[PDB]
Amino acid sequence: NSTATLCLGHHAVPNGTIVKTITNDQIEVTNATELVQNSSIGEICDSPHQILDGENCTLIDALLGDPQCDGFQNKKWDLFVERSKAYSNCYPYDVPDYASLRSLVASSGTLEFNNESFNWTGVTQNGTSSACIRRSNNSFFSRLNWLTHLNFKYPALNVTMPNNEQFDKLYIWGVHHPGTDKDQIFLYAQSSGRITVSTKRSQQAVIPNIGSRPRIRNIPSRISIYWTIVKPGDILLINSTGNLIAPRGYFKIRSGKSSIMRSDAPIGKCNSECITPNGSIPNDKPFQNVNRITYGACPRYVKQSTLKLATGMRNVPEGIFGAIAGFIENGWEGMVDGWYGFRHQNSEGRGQAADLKSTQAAIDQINGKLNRLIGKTNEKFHQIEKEFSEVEGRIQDLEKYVEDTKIDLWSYNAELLVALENQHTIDLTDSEMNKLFEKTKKQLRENAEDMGNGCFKIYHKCDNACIGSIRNGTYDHDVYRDEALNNRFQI
Amino acid sequence: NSTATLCLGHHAVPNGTIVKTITNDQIEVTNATELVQNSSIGEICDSPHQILDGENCTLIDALLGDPQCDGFQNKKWDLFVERSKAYSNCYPYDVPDYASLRSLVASSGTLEFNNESFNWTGVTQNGTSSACIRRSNNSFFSRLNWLTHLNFKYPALNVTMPNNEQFDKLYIWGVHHPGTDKDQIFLYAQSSGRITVSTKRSQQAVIPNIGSRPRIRNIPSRISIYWTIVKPGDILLINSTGNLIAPRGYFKIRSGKSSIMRSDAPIGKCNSECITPNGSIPNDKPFQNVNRITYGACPRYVKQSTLKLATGMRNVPEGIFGAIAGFIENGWEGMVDGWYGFRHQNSEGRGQAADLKSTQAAIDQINGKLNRLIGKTNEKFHQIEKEFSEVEGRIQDLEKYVEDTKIDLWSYNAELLVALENQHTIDLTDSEMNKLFEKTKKQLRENAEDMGNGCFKIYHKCDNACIGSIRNGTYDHDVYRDEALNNRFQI
Amino acid sequence: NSTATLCLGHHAVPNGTIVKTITNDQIEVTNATELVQNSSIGEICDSPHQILDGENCTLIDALLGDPQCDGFQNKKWDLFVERSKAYSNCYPYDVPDYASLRSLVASSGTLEFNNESFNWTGVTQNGTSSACIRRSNNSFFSRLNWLTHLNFKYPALNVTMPNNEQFDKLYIWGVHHPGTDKDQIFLYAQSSGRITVSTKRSQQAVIPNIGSRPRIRNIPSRISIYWTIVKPGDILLINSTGNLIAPRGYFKIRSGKSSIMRSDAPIGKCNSECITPNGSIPNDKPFQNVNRITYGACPRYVKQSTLKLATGMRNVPEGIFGAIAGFIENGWEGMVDGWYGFRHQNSEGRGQAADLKSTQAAIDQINGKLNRLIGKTNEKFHQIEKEFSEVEGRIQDLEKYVEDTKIDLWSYNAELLVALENQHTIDLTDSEMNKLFEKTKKQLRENAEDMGNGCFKIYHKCDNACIGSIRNGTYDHDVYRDEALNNRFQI
Ligand SMILES: *[C@@H]1O[C@H](CO)[C@@H](O[C@@H]2O[C@H](CO)[C@@H](O)[C@H](O)[C@H]2NC(C)=O)[C@H](O)[C@H]1NC(C)=O
Ligand SMILES: *[C@@H]1O[C@H](CO)[C@@H](O[C@@H]2O[C@H](CO)[C@@H](O)[C@H](O)[C@H]2NC(C)=O)[C@H](O)[C@H]1NC(C)=O
Ligand SMILES: *[C@@H]1O[C@H](CO)[C@@H](O[C@@H]2O[C@H](CO)[C@@H](O)[C@H](O)[C@H]2NC(C)=O)[C@H](O)[C@H]1NC(C)=O
Ligand SMILES: *[C@@H]1O[C@H](CO)[C@@H](O)[C@H](O)[C@H]1NC(C)=O
Ligand SMILES: *[C@@H]1O[C@H](CO)[C@@H](O)[C@H](O)[C@H]1NC(C)=O
Ligand SMILES: *[C@@H]1O[C@H](CO)[C@@H](O)[C@H](O)[C@H]1NC(C)=O
Ligand SMILES: *[C@@H]1O[C@H](CO)[C@@H](O)[C@H](O)[C@H]1NC(C)=O
Ligand SMILES: *[C@@H]1O[C@H](CO)[C@@H](O)[C@H](O)[C@H]1NC(C)=O
Ligand SMILES: *[C@@H]1O[C@H](CO)[C@@H](O)[C@H](O)[C@H]1NC(C)=O
Ligand SMILES: *[C@@H]1O[C@H](CO)[C@@H](O)[C@H](O)[C@H]1NC(C)=O
Ligand SMILES: *[C@@H]1O[C@H](CO)[C@@H](O)[C@H](O)[C@H]1NC(C)=O
Ligand SMILES: *[C@@H]1O[C@H](CO)[C@@H](O)[C@H](O)[C@H]1NC(C)=O
Ligand SMILES: *[C@@H]1O[C@H](CO)[C@@H](O)[C@H](O)[C@H]1NC(C)=O
Ligand SMILES: *[C@@H]1O[C@H](CO)[C@@H](O)[C@H](O)[C@H]1NC(C)=O
Ligand SMILES: *[C@@H]1O[C@H](CO)[C@@H](O)[C@H](O)[C@H]1NC(C)=O
Ligand SMILES: *[C@@H]1O[C@H](CO)[C@@H](O)[C@H](O)[C@H]1NC(C)=O
Ligand SMILES: *[C@@H]1O[C@H](CO)[C@@H](O)[C@H](O)[C@H]1NC(C)=O
Ligand SMILES: *[C@@H]1O[C@H](CO)[C@@H](O)[C@H](O)[C@H]1NC(C)=O
Ligand SMILES: *[C@@H]1O[C@H](CO)[C@@H](O)[C@H](O)[C@H]1NC(C)=O
Ligand SMILES: *[C@@H]1O[C@H](CO)[C@@H](O)[C@H](O)[C@H]1NC(C)=O
Ligand SMILES: *[C@@H]1O[C@H](CO)[C@@H](O)[C@H](O)[C@H]1NC(C)=O
Ligand SMILES: *[C@@H]1O[C@H](CO)[C@@H](O)[C@H](O)[C@H]1NC(C)=O
Ligand SMILES: *[C@@H]1O[C@H](CO)[C@@H](O)[C@H](O)[C@H]1NC(C)=O
Ligand SMILES: *[C@@H]1O[C@H](CO)[C@@H](O)[C@H](O)[C@H]1NC(C)=O
DSSP states (O other): OOSEEEEEEEBOOSSOEEEOOSSOSOEEESOEEEOEEOOOOSOEEEETTTEEEOTTOOHHHHHHTOGGGGGGTTOBOSEEEEOTTOOOOSSOEEOTTHHHHHHHHHHHTBOOEEEOOOOOTTEEOSOOEEEEESSSSEEOOTTEEEOEEBTTBOOOEEEEEEOOSSSOEEEEEEEEEOSSHHHHHHHHSSSSOOEEEEOSSOEEEEOOOOOOOOOBTTBOOEEEEEEEEEOTTOEEEEEESSOEEEESEEEEOOOSSOEEEEOOOOEEEEEOSEEETTEEEOOSSSEEOSOSOOEEEEOEEOSOSOOEEEOSOBOOOOOTTSTBTTTBOOOBTTOOSOSEEEEEEETTEEEEEEOHHHHHHHHHHHHHHHHHHSSOOEEEOSOOOOOOSSOOOHHHHHHHHHHHHHHHHHHHHHHHHHHHHHHHHHHHHHHHHHHHHHHHHHHHTTSEEEOSSSEEEEOSOOOHHHHHHHHTTOOOGGGTHHHHHHHHSOO | OOSEEEEEEEBOOSSOEEEOOSSOSOEEESOEEEOEEOOOOSOEEEETTTEEEOTTOOHHHHHHTOGGGGGGTTOBOSEEEEOTTOOOOSSOEEOTTHHHHHHHHHHHTBOOEEEOOOOOTTEEOSOOEEEEESSSSEEOOTTEEEOEEBTTBOOOEEEEEEOOSSSOEEEEEEEEEOSSHHHHHHHHSSSSOOEEEEOSSOEEEEOOOOOOOOOBTTBOOEEEEEEEEEOTTOEEEEEESSOEEEESEEEEOOOSSOEEEEOOOOEEEEEOSEEETTEEEOOSSSEEOSOSOOEEEEOEEOSOSOOEEEOSOBOOOOOTTSTBTTTBOOOBTTOOSOSEEEEEEETTEEEEEEOHHHHHHHHHHHHHHHHHHSSOOEEEOSOOOOOOSSOOOHHHHHHHHHHHHHHHHHHHHHHHHHHHHHHHHHHHHHHHHHHHHHHHHHHHTTSEEEOSSSEEEEOSOOOHHHHHHHHTTOOOGGGTHHHHHHHHSOO | OOSEEEEEEEBOOSSOEEEOOSSOSOEEESOEEEOEEOOOOSOEEEETTTEEEOTTOOHHHHHHTOGGGGGGTTOBOSEEEEOTTOOOOSSOEEOTTHHHHHHHHHHHTBOOEEEOOOOOTTEEOSOOEEEEESSSSEEOOTTEEEOEEBTTBOOOEEEEEEOOSSSOEEEEEEEEEOSSHHHHHHHHSSSSOOEEEEOSSOEEEEOOOOOOOOOBTTBOOEEEEEEEEEOTTOEEEEEESSOEEEESEEEEOOOSSOEEEEOOOOEEEEEOSEEETTEEEOOSSSEEOSOSOOEEEEOEEOSOSOOEEEOSOBOOOOOTTSTBTTTBOOOBTTOOSOSEEEEEEETTEEEEEEOHHHHHHHHHHHHHHHHHHSSOOEEEOSOOOOOOSSOOOHHHHHHHHHHHHHHHHHHHHHHHHHHHHHHHHHHHHHHHHHHHHHHHHHHHTTSEEEOSSSEEEEOSOOOHHHHHHHHTTOOOGGGTHHHHHHHHSOO
16 A cells, blocks of 8 residues: 556457368457448449340340330430340341340440441342330331332342441341242242351351241241351452341440349339349458449458458457467456547556557558458459359350359468458457567656556556556656665665 | 566477568568468369269260260269360261350260151161261161151151240251262252251251361361250241251250360279369368369369468568567477467576467457368369460450459459468467457556566566466465565665 | 676667558658569560560461461460550451450460361352452461362361360461452352351351441451360361351460560560569569469559568667667667667776677568568460450459459458568567567666666676676576675665
């Protein structure tokens, strides 16, 4: 009682959180934050990306000009959304390398179309079908021109169209395969028919195949769709002796951030940068578990459902430096104004006071880690397909393997990052506690002794102002040294 | 001799192991474990994966029904093993996109076949050849039906088969290319021949090519093999005016964990989860150097032949805290009951005793690291091919580049992991030594002085029980303080 | 003045460098080195890789034997350089899967050609054109043999050539597509024409397409180029009823480190291991920002423009251990002979002296890090294409995605490496300072007190030799203990 006690300590909480570290699967810290986004609000926000809901139409149908898709003419988009309910209702068609055509249009991000005046002298234009009804009349694909005989003759066509513009042109055309030699005659007079479109660089030669296929909406015949790109200075050349489904012009083709996504999520009136087929997701977190398919500024897809980053010290209720969970037996739940602090007992009573500088030093370092991880996602746009409806073999094996490889490597990065940062966070918070203890020890010089539990026995009368002077670094040890030495060194 | 000495220390071994760290290429630790599996026992264990040894047959041969492969009918597998000795002994055939067909069947993991009654009215069935002898009789592929003329006519076929099941059907069929116009006539009457198989979604139109090719087992003619998948609600339609090698039914096609592997390793009667073409390998280690081609729960392939993870402290015979290989001059080889401990000299003699708590604290942290690395491999099944017998160009360049990219990234991860963990292991073991020293120092209060080499000069008579009380944390410094102070502070 | 002062400290510099760490975006260290190579000298060094400047010729042109490329006959290369100015000046041609042919030849790394004596009995050889003029005479591709009718007949060819060598043979051949039925007759007599080349394993059947295409240098007709590889024991078989552009022999095909690169950088007379299309770059740094396309022992391509690795301590003008930027208020700019040292004040004056052992300990650890990062790049040769002149869709999407995935993963590795190493460098340098302070403290025993700012108050007369004895570890505390204790413990 000619003595005082000053104890160093740290806070603790009743509701701790378990995190993983390098050396321990399960360690409790005072606070943590989740690094994996695991939920979507279920809506694709219409902002800030230009969304185009395909609704009942696929991109290719909107491209060809299925009557149902007339409203999509010349539209642009950042992201085209294809619905699973979509269906075609014009003339039955197939596209060799459908996936590539879908991909290049999606990436181009525009349906801008310019009509061109082709010289179809000698044939009937604007062929039409009951399989493709527009305004209650028999019709056809808006962007295609079905040519037939005129006066029972189909002269050999040799039609040309130069690109004298400064942009590429995307031409879509097709070949008709009648189900009977009869229909072939009726339509084109010729028995066979043959199509050949050329540029200076390319040749696409198609020979139609007369034959009945299983009926799609009662049609046993087909149209096969092809595309050719013509750059400035080049020339399109169309030779046909029949069966040619002619283009009415070209599509502008652009390069940019556009893409396409399969999803049944409704479009919402809201604003979110990251889109998944499940809906838009927040992008504050560096990782996400929602979908490997994404568009925009998105967290990276990982396999883990949760990854907790410690944002506080080890929680010790009741480190490499050995203070926290070390010579300091436990934390103080009653310290709610700081992370580290002092408890004292003197002549005037018992008190507690937080140390702000050490508290802030720990918090600044943790915020530095958070600044590296939170709100820094990277933009991805058009990628590769990652779900498949049909078996294809080799190329699909490769696309799947590439994505699986990527996810495992990011899942590894995420796992190690959290384990490493957490080990370091627990060590830096232990370090700050140790520094405060060491600083206090040096301050007291020969006037006190370390009791080994984070407490100092102070060998002199130390009232509240004296204790306060120690806490704020103005303690003058020389003032008390004589009193202290006499108390320490006696019998 | 009115004094005692208490020394803090750590163990050492005569047979140390060299490891790599962040700051040092070559540092000796007391113990380490290997992280790269570099050997196989040379056998593919038949458990716990269902192995199917192709022996003399390739998967495609077993699929088509080469007589040699009759025993493989309707078999399933987790892993099909193709031998380099395998050879075909039926009718000469090629498969366009052979690799894709092989891949999709392998992945399906079943040869389950259901016969279907096709209406081949107007043609001769069960065509047969001396190139494909079964039970000493001329025969053919068990799953294929060779159609020829009947009464010197081959009427146009238009055969249909609907899928009214709930599973997909895999149809295998082929086209015959006779080596002479003569054989073409003899077999099909028609001069040309043409095959066309269709679904609602697809058309495969093949025009046979009459001509002699270099003879395979004395046959200058060929059969080209094709496949079509028909989903529920869809319909197969076969038009042929000749040269059609007909299917006798369909294969069930499944999705699962099945795959195929090229290997000449014998099948063994044993149990191992990871299979490589070199044989099965243990999967206790996280990495392996045996083969980039694997199946099952396997360590990840890396380029390093060895990667040693330290599992003990730095070995100092004769860290950031500066105790081990620091102010403690060397380790104690004679300490074999613990990692850290005390050596003393007093009136009763000289002794040594291990400290169990600090020993266990270090061991627990190292075991925590091991638990993260040992026995946690990840299952891979069907992947991409990684060895190639023929030049292909673009697609093969891509498959090779993908695998090479993946291996370099995992080899990096493995290298950094070991360097980081080892640096940390050496630092945590140094830390535990420092904590024990600091704890002991505080215990002794004013009764001892640090001699600077991990030893304390104790300024009072301290018999064995006194030394023991220090080691077990029951030392009461107040008991000796007067004696100690008088000894310390004199002239 | 019956006392002395000994201060521990570290150096500082006026020109510090900002680096990134785990906990801080911007921290100043005494020195750093750049890890990202961002510049090229603009030349492709001709050493030590065998460079072949294509100049006006593409690889395929040199392969076919465009007259302009005669000088390239039988050349080999490690790297073939294609110029953007290159142009073809022989007969107009296209190659289906051009990219694959270009790739396999580039990778083979040789134009070694062996002539073979084919039996072209019944046809005219050495066909020739005004579209391909050699030495001012009408000519043709040096490696191809244009066959035409002889005496207005073109008999069915059935020509064979066995591979009885021990190496593979690469055969290049082609099909001619005349622009008129007239030219077809004039050249081959036959109305149609058909080509079929076979091996035991393969068949390539081409049917020429008569028709005019847009004129390339006034030619409306084309030659389509094909290749076939024939292994030892196999046989090439050529059937043609017309339009066959015949091979004159085979190319040797090798496997090795060769590749091809598009670049307009001049070839220089110098020596560099890493080549980019921008020019050769130094490979001392682990990363580079110059080009994702590389050949040789090259730093890895990353997205960051700069990544600074700290190679010195924190710069404090005017860590987890709390010495540097901690209880030591600031560094000493006047200490230029070491990183750590002593400053003293005694009866004889004030002095400064570096500590070499602690200085060297820090430097050795930093050099250990540098040794892991500097001068250890990995060799890559033939890879995948990474820039594209035409839209292709699916396969190109995959090639782009693979490269983008790889770069992001390496960019991550590089970012984390620097942040981690820098945090550790700052901590190890702080640690060395702390160790020196602790060692000095123990040396002084009871003869001095820690003033809390890295300085010791020494409680006895300590001349220059005495101070020197402390710095070199020969200080005998017992010599001064009586004097010191009397000074410390008084009133
Ligand atoms: C080839 O076979 C198919 C199947 O029998 C025929 O297609 C059917 O034709 C009938 C009437 O002609 C339709 O009512 C069916 O809906 C069709 N079925 C399918 C699946 O398309 C086809 O007519 C036959 N070809 C010829 C020329 O006879
Ligand atoms: C085309 O040429 C090949 C090679 O000369 C001929 O194939 C050979 O035919 C003979 C007997 O007819 C056999 O003994 C050889 O084994 C065959 N060689 C090969 C490599 O197949 C073929 O007959 C010729 N075509 C025609 C119709 O004459
Ligand atoms: C098909 O159309 C093209 C374009 O009109 C014709 O090619 C032109 O032919 C004339 C003279 O015959 C040349 O002067 C032009 O340079 C050619 N243009 C191009 C782009 O090639 C071609 O002649 C026509 N085909 C036929 C058989 O008449
Ligand atoms: C602990 O409780 C407080 C208030 O109830 C809350 O703010 C804090 O987030 C809780 N800790 C956690 C993360 O459970
Ligand atoms: C837990 O940590 C996060 C990130 O620092 C912070 O947003 C949250 O407020 C913290 N909770 C408490 C109780 O401090
Ligand atoms: C989509 O098609 C369905 C018919 O299945 C119809 O109910 C609906 O009106 C269509 N929506 C639009 C926008 O055309
Ligand atoms: C074909 O129809 C389009 C509108 O669909 C029209 O612009 C054009 O005049 C028609 N051409 C002929 C010859 O009927
Ligand atoms: C293909 O099948 C049907 C029925 O015979 C028909 O479309 C066509 O005539 C067939 N092909 C030939 C060459 O007869
Ligand atoms: C998102 O969709 C996928 C299926 O495409 C599903 O596996 C996953 O559970 C969904 N995620 C969430 C959080 O809804
Ligand atoms: C330090 O604490 C003492 C005691 O309360 C007080 O008198 C003084 O204002 C404080 N000094 C500073 C600089 O904060
Ligand atoms: C050292 O020797 C002992 C027994 O001979 C053995 O258990 C230990 O593994 C050895 N250390 C190594 C890894 O060489
Ligand atoms: C070396 O370390 C490994 C892993 O902890 C252990 O299995 C082995 O027993 C150790 N050897 C010795 C001598 O302790
Ligand atoms: C495999 O083929 C060889 C002939 O090369 C023969 O010796 C052996 O009997 C065959 N094995 C089986 C199981 O058919
Ligand atoms: C064809 O052979 C199979 C057995 O190989 C038999 O089931 C079928 O009855 C035969 N059909 C005819 C018409 O011979
Ligand atoms: C192809 O070559 C051989 C020999 O002439 C034969 O199979 C066939 O007759 C040839 N093709 C034609 C169209 O004659
Ligand atoms: C495994 O096989 C590969 C060849 O496929 C060979 O390069 C490697 O040396 C083998 N590994 C072992 C450990 O046998
Ligand atoms: C501590 O050591 C002393 C001396 O041997 C002994 O008397 C006592 O049993 C020990 N106490 C405990 C709690 O282990
Ligand atoms: C600081 O200046 C010296 C000499 O002027 C120079 O050697 C050193 O590199 C400079 N530091 C940096 C990296 O700016
Ligand atoms: C800075 O660090 C690098 C690498 O250690 C070294 O080359 C350079 O000389 C250093 N500069 C100074 C001023 O020491
Ligand atoms: C390359 O072609 C150009 C013509 O554009 C010519 O000036 C130059 O001589 C050619 N170079 C060589 C080496 O043939
Ligand atoms: C064809 O020309 C080549 C040289 O270009 C020559 O070696 C060969 O003798 C010629 N053959 C004939 C039949 O003219
Ligand atoms: C293709 O177009 C041109 C002009 O008619 C010509 O090359 C050829 O005659 C055409 N094809 C047919 C089958 O007439
Ligand atoms: C190298 O070339 C690429 C274009 O291929 C360009 O983007 C980049 O700026 C160039 N880098 C340097 C350092 O010249
Ligand atoms: C230590 O320093 C003292 C004082 O200068 C000097 O006498 C002696 O040579 C030094 N000893 C050693 C071993 O360097």
